[PDB]
Amino acid sequence: MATALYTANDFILISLPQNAQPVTAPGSKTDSWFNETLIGGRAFVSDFKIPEFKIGSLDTLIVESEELSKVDNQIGASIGKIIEILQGLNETSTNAYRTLPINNMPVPEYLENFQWQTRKFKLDKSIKDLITLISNESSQLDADVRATYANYNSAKTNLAAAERKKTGDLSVRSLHDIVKPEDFVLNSEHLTTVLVAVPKSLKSDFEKSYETLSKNVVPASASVIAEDAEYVLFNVHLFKKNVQEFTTAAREKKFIPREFNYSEELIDQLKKEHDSAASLEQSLRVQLVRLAKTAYVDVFINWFHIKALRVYVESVLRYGLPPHFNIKIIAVPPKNLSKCKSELIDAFGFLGGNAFMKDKKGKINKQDTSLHQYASLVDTEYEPFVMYIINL
Amino acid sequence: AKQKMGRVMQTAAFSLAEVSYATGENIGYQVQESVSTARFKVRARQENVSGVYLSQFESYIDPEINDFRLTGLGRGGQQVQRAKEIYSRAVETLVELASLQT
Amino acid sequence: AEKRTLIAVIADEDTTTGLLLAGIGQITPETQEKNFFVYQEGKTTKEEITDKFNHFTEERDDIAILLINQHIAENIRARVDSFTNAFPAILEIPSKDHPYDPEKDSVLKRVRKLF
Amino acid sequence: GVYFNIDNGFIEGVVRGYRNGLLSNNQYINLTQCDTLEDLKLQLSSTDYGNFLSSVSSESLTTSLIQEYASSKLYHEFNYIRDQSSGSTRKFMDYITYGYMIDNVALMITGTIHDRDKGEILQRCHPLGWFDTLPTLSVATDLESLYETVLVDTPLAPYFKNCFDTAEELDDMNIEIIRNKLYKAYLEDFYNFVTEEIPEPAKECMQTLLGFEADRRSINIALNSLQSSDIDPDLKSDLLPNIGKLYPLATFHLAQAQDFEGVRAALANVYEYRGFLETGNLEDHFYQLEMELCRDAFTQQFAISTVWAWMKSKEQEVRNITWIAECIAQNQRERINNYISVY
Numbered sequence: 001m002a003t004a005l006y007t008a009n010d011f012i013l014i015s016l017p018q019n020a021q022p023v024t025a026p027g028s029k030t031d032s033w034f035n036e037t038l039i040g041g042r043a044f045v046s047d048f049k050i051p052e053f054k055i056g057s058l059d060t061l062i063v064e065s066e067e068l069s070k071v072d073n074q075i076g077a078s079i080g081k082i083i084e085i086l087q088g089l090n091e092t093s094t095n096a097y098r099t100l101p102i103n104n105m106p107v108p109e110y111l112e113n114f115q116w117q118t119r120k121f122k123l124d125k126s127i128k129d130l131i132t133l134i135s136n137e138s139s140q141l142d143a144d145v146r147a148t149y150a151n152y153n154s155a156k157t158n159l160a161a162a163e164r165k166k167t168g169d170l171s172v173r174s175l176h177d178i179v180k181p182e183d184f185v186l187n188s189e190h191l192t193t194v195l196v197a198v199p200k201s202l203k204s205d206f207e208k209s210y211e212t213l214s215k216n217v218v219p220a221s222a223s224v225i226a227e228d229a230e231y232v233l234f235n236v237h238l239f240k241k242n243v244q245e246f247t248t249a250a251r252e253k254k255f256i257p258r259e260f261n262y263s264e265e266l267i268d269q270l271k272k273e274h275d276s277a278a279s280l281e282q283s284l285r286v287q288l289v290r291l292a293k294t295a296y297v298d299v300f301i302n303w304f305h306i307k308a309l310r311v312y313v314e315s316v317l318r319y320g321l322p323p324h325f326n327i328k329i330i331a332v333p334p335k336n337l338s339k340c341k342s343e344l345i346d347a348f349g350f351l352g353g354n355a356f357m358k359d360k361k362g363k364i365n366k367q368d369t370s371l372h373q374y375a376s377l378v379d380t381e382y383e384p385f386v387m388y389i390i391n392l
Numbered sequence: 393a394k395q396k397m398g399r400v401m402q403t404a405a406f407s408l409a410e411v412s413y414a415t416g417e418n419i420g421y422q423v424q425e426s427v428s429t430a431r432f433k434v435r436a437r438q439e440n441v442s443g444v445y446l447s448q449f450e451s452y453i454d455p456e457i458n459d460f461r462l463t464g465l466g467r468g469g470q471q472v473q474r475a476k477e478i479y480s481r482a483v484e485t486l487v488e489l490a491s492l493q494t
Numbered sequence: 495a496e497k498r499t500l501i502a503v504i505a506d507e508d509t510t511t512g513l514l515l516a517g518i519g520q521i522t523p524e525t526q527e528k529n530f531f532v533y534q535e536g537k538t539t540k541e542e543i544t545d546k547f548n549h550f551t552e553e554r555d556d557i558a559i560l561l562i563n564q565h566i567a568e569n570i571r572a573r574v575d576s577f578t579n580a581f582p583a584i585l586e587i588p589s590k591d592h593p594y595d596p597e598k599d600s601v602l603k604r605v606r607k608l609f
Numbered sequence: 610g611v612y613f614n615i616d617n618g619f620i621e622g623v624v625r626g627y628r629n630g631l632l633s634n635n636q637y638i639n640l641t642q643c644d645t646l647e648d649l650k651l652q653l654s655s656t657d658y659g660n661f662l663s664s665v666s667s668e669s670l671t672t673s674l675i676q677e678y679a680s681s682k683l684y685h686e687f688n689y690i691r692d693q694s695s696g697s698t699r700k701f702m703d704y705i706t707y708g709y710m711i712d713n714v715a716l717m718i719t720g721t722i723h724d725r726d727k728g729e730i731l732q733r734c735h736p737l738g739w740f741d742t743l744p745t746l747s748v749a750t751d752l753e754s755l756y757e758t759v760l761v762d763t764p765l766a767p768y769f770k771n772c773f774d775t776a777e778e779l780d781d782m783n784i785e786i787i788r789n790k791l792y793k794a795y796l797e798d799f800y801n802f803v804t805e806e807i808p809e810p811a812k813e814c815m816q817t818l819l820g821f822e823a824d825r826r827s828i829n830i831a832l833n834s835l836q837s838s839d840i841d842p843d844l845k846s847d848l849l850p851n852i853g854k855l856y857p858l859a860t861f862h863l864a865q866a867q868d869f870e871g872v873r874a875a876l877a878n879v880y881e882y883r884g885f886l887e888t889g890n891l892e893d894h895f896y897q898l899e900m901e902l903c904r905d906a907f908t909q910q911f912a913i914s915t916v917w918a919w920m921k922s923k924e925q926e927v928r929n930i931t932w933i934a935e936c937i938a939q940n941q942r943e944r945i946n947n948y949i950s951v952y
Contacts, residue, residue: 077666368655369639370648394599398588401509405590406939408512413676414928417716418733420511424532425723426781431517434558436496447580449558457517461837462719464785465712466792466826467899469833470892476515483516486587487501490559493601494583 008107009331022347046112158277170197170231186262214246352384404482415468565589610911630657709738715788768794800852811912823853831863
C-alpha cells in the first residue's frame, strides 16, 4: 500500500505467551526485540492488552470463534461499501475518505489508546451478546447508507429526464417555462394548439404546406417558438375537429407531431417535476455524506473490536496456560509488511510447532479442492503462531 | 399433501431452471406467447363426504396443444422438449392433490 | 357447478413457465387477459400481486383453482386471509427454494377455528 | 504446417494452453464429491477457473450464476483469441459467431411478439453473437421490415435468400422456420468457406466438425417436426442443411418422415448415427459424439480447427459444471455422473 494510507500505517496484531522468546536473535527480551530488531528499529510498537471475558464452556468457545470470523468479514464488507459510496459521491481527499483518521485522530494513535473502547460494550458482560451487538450495529448502519444512496441514484434519474422536457431534443420536449395566450390555447371552446416538430431540412416545406394539411387552420400562426439542432418546434392553432386529421397528415409527410395542451395542471406539473427532483437529490446529498462519515467511524471501531477479541479468543483456545498474554500491535511503515511478517514467523513460530513454521513472506492463500485450504473457515496450513494482519 | 406438492413443483422447477441456463437463452417468454389454451382443464363433480356434498375436481387432458412451436434450438432444443415431458407429469400430481384442498 | 375449468397462477417466473409447459393457463378469448401472473424477485410491485389476486378470486368466477406460492402469498397476506370462500379455491403450495412452512398458509388459519 | 505459425503461431499455443485447462475425469469426480455450491466454488478455484466467482461471496451464489460467469470467461478468452487474429483467421472467428448471431436474432424477435421488455430479453442473449443493431430488432413485427431496416447491414444478410415473407407478420411457428433456414444457409456458407480458404489439415477435420453440426441440426429439425409442426416435405426440405454426411440419401427420408419410425429407419442406414435413436438420452449421444469429434481435432497440430474444438469442448465443460452444480444444489444425485468427459 501507498495510496490507501496517507497518515495511517499498516498493522500486525499478534499475541504470544509472556514466555515467548525470539530465535531470530536469541537472548533478547520479547519487548526489546520488537523495538530494536524488527525491521531496522523503524517499528512502532504499541500495547493492545485487553482484559478477560467470561467464558461459559469449552463447547461454547468453539462457537465463539465461528461468530468472530464471519462477522469480521461482514464488517470489512460494510466498510468496503461505505468507502465505495463516498468515492461515488465524489468525496476524495488527500488525507481522508481513503484513509480517514479515526475521529480525526491518526490511526496508529487510535489503536494505541484502543484498550477496549466502551460505547455500550462492557468488560464484565458475557462474550456472546457483545459479538452480536457489534455486528447488529454495523449492519443497521450499512442498510442506512445503502438505502439513502438508492434513493439518491433514483432522484438523479428524475432530474435528468425532466431537464430534457424543459429544453432538449423534440421527442420529449414541449415548452412550459413560457406560456402565452397566442402561442398556446386549449381553454377556448373552438380552438386548440398542436405543436409539430419538423426536421430542419423539412422546415421550409412545413411553412408552405401546413395550411393545406387540414381544414380551418388559423392563418399565419406557423412560427418557430423553439429550436435545437435536429428538429424545430412550431405552433399552429386550428379548429378542434381538424386536430386528428392534422396530426395524421403530418406524420405521413415525415413531420412529427409533439403533444402539448394548454392545460394549466400539466404546465404547472412540468416545472414542478424538475424543481422537486433537484430539491430531493440535494436533501439526500447532504444527509448521505454526513451519514457515511458517522457510519464510517463507528464501523471502524467495531472492526477493531472484533479483531482484538478474535486474537484474545484464539490465543486462549490454542495456548492455554499462562492466563495472561503478551499482546502487541506493531505498525509497519509502508511496503515493508512482508519482510516484517517473515522476521516474526521465524522468531515466534517454533512455539506452534517444529514443522508447522515454514518461511513465508507475503500472505499465502490457498483455496484449491480440500487438499489445499487456508481460511479460518477450513485450513490445512496457516500461521503457527496467532496472527492477524490489519490493513486499511 | 402440501409437502408432496412443494416437492413435485420444486424438483420440476429446478429441472426447468437447468434447461434454461444450459441451452443458452430464456425460454419462459416464448412459452407465454405461444399459449392461448389450457391443455389440462378440470371437470367439477360433487362427492358426498359425510351429510354434505363437497366439491371435487378431476383433471382431463384435452389435446388442444402438444408441446409448443418454439423448439428448434438445434442441440439445446432437446433439453427444452424433455423439460415439458417432466413438467406435464409433475402438474398432474399437484392437480389431483389440489382437489382435497377444496 | 361446472362453469369453472381454469387454473390461475400466481407464481415466480421459472415456476409459471413450468406450469405453462404442462398447460393450465391461457390468454382468455372472452376478455383478452392471462390466467397467469408472472412475478420476479425484487423487480415487480407489491401492488401488482394484490390486483391479480383480487382479479382471479372475485372478478373471475371461471377459475377453479388459484395456485399461489407461499412466499408471494405472504406479500399480499391481508388479501389472501381476507378471501375465505371455496369458490374459487385458494391453495398455497410451497414456493421455490423453500419447503412447507405453516406460517404463510391462509387455509390452515381458517381450520384452527373449530374442529 | 510450414506456413501456419506466421499469423497463427501465438494464437494456437495459447489455445493449446487453454486446452490444458479442460477438466479431466478425476477433476470431475472431485467436483461430484462436493456438498455445497461453496465447496464446488472452492474446488473449481484449484483448476484454471481460479477465483472467477470471487465477487459473489457465498450468499448470492446460485447454480445459474456459475453458468453465467464460467461461460463469461469462455467468451472473454474467445475475444482475446479473436483480437489477435488477422486475415483468414479473423474471418474464421467471425464465421463462428454468426451462428450465435442467428440464435440472438431468433431470440430477440420472439421477445417482441410476446411483448416482453427489451432490457430483459437481451440479458438472455448470447454475448458472442452481438452485432450493433441487435437491440433494434424490437422495432417491427414482420420479416420484411426487420430485414430491410436492420438486417441488411448485418453479416446475416446473405442468409435471407429463401425466407419467403408472404406478408404474414410473425407467430411463433415461422420464427423457428426463419431460424432453421438462416442456420441452413449459414452452414452452407461456412462449409464453403472452410473448403475454399482454410488450409488442408484444418480443412478435413473442420468439414467433419461442421457436417456433424449439420447432421445434428437435420435430425433435430426432422424430429421436432413431429410434435409441434404440420408441414409439407417440400417445405421441410428447405430447412435441412446440405453439406453433411447425412444429406443426399438420408435427409430425403427425413423430409418425408411423418412418424418416429420414418426417422429411425432413415437413420438406421447411416453408419455412425444408428443406435442413437434406440436407447438413452439422444442429446447426450450428440454431445458425446461432438466431444469425440473435438478430441481428435486437437491431435492434429497445425490446424485452426483447434479453436472450434476448444470452444465447443469448453462449452461442454461449462455445461458439465452447470449440471453438477444443479445436482449438488437441488440435492438430487441419482444422475450426477451424467457429465461427458473425453479429456
